[PDB]
Design a protein around this ligand. Sequence first.
Ligand SMILES: *[C@@H]1O[C@H](CO)[C@@H](O)[C@H](O)[C@H]1NC(C)=O
Ligand SMILES: *[C@@H]1O[C@H](CO)[C@@H](O)[C@H](O)[C@H]1NC(C)=O
Lengths: 164, 218, 98, 147, 37
Amino acid sequence: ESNKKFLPFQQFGRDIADTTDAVRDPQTLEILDITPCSFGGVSVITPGTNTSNEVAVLYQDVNCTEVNVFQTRAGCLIGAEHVNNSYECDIPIGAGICASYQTSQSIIAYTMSLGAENSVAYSNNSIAIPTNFTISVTTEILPVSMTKTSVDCTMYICGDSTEC
Amino acid sequence: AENSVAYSNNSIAIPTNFTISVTTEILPVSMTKTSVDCTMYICGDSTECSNLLLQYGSFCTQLNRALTGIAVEQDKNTQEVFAQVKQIYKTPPIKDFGGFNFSQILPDPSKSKRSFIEDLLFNKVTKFNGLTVLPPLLTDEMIAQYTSALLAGTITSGWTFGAGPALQIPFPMQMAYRFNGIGVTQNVLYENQKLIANQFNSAIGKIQDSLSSTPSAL
Amino acid sequence: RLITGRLQSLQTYVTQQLIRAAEIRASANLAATKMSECVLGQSKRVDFCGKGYHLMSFPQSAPHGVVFLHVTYVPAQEKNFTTAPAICHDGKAHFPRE
Amino acid sequence: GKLQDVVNQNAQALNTLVKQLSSNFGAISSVLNDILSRLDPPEAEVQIDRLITGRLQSLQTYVTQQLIRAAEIRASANLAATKMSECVLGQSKRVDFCGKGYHLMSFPQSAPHGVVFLHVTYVPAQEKNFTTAPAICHDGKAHFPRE
Amino acid sequence: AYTNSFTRGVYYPDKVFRSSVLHSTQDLFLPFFSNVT
Ligand SMILES: *[C@@H]1O[C@H](CO)[C@@H](O)[C@H](O)[C@H]1NC(C)=O
Ligand SMILES: *[C@@H]1O[C@H](CO)[C@@H](O)[C@H](O)[C@H]1NC(C)=O
């Protein structure tokens, strides 16, 4: 049941992309909204098979009514508990939801936390000064080259064919 | 505009005052994570079309792979920029930063716990064929929680929080470190702290106007 | 005829996406670098963190972006003077320390 | 995983290039000799045209994704060349460029299609609270620390 | 006599309903600022 107010002589509705949007019913002159029935993708949220074979399925952009059942902004999450805590992100989902396999143990779906809280004891005369140190050595890996691959026209397209 | 410096072999010019100018730089960091389906876009609800499409092989097993790699990377772009600090720092409940005023950049609890300036940026800037737009992994409330950690860590600790354990230092004193790092002695700031605090506060205020006046800034 | 026409139209869109997404990665790497060096420390690279002598910067988020407020110290009110490389007092040359 | 991801991306792109040879592109058969023997030259020319056009695009696509990918590696070979001029061959003052800390020195280590930097950095530890003062007065004059 | 048709002569080329859209269509319209006999 739509809300647009068509003109007296109008029977169609269109968007910017020239896609049909609303229709006026010929029998009862009432305007109807058209929304395509839900589609999307299926994603399987899983810890490694090295750990378990229990997976959780997420249906992207679905109201859970078209498919223990958690509804997020990414879509309908089936098979994962919803916890009110907040841990570090393990498996991203979307809109801040990260699922993880933890304690028996099952798959949860929490809202990820942005690191551990800390407040600096700041005053207008207090300064903190280190007294020791550590010499830490970190590793950085960077790709620098690829494989020099060449492909021939005649052999790839018409391999051993004079007519081709 | 033309200018010629009065240059001689014994004449030197030396400044006697200064100004604390605060400029704005805007940088794009991410895009919309858009994915497009092969079957629905090309042969939407057509079995005959779908069967013939299979003759092309895996042309659009690549496209769903290409458009995904973009999308999983758009979330890395946002993570490298903001997610640089580990502990979520906070400003003290007091605000006696030597007389410097950060209310226009710091979050305010009178609202979306964004700040004054962040809201100006957010106000200003404003399907039938498998066009699915994925949601960003970090929602804008988390991102603005990240820039408050960087803002609050800078104000209380300086540069000591991106290099190791966060060590606090008074903001009146930290600016003496910053001044001392551009060739100007410490006592220049201390003797003129009252003037400098006003120059910093006044320059920040013009930022909101500069974005609010002309909409072509962003 | 239609599917081939629609394959190219989908093929073109992804290619322009790959070129455009690489233009944003070069801006997300610059903003990640302007935050490590301007915000989380004081910079000595000229015109990197604003035109002036860099003091500090404050990030502000924005939709699909980031805004840096580069606090810089600008000299003003220059005055002419007369300079000298060195001065002699006792037959020896004196150079300023700093 | 950074150097390995480069290897997988190239191999998958090449394997997809090869497997595209087993596609009809609207022709009768994917084998060149089979379509040649089965039909007459007046008709096989049309079926030949359908395959080659399908194989031109499949080769055209592969090179384009190579040009985009090779420009992603040149932006990493320019960064590694810059992290060696500034981190290894001299001490850096750019924050978080050569590792998280205060940079001391770095040592390059080669790797297959890549390079590994070991960023030796000095990290402060064991902070202690104190009470600070901008200046001290002794004889009616203000004293500021030198360094 | 002749007169100047300032802005009149514009009609709905179809039934469809468009809200806050600057649609551009090619059909037989009265040219702007024309000469009406
Ligand atoms: C799902 O449908 C229900 C009807 O019970 C509606 O109230 C709700 O808003 C819908 N949710 C979403 C996320 O569209
Ligand atoms: C046509 O229009 C012109 C100017 O628009 C006007 O001068 C003229 O009288 C009109 N009529 C004819 C018949 O030219």
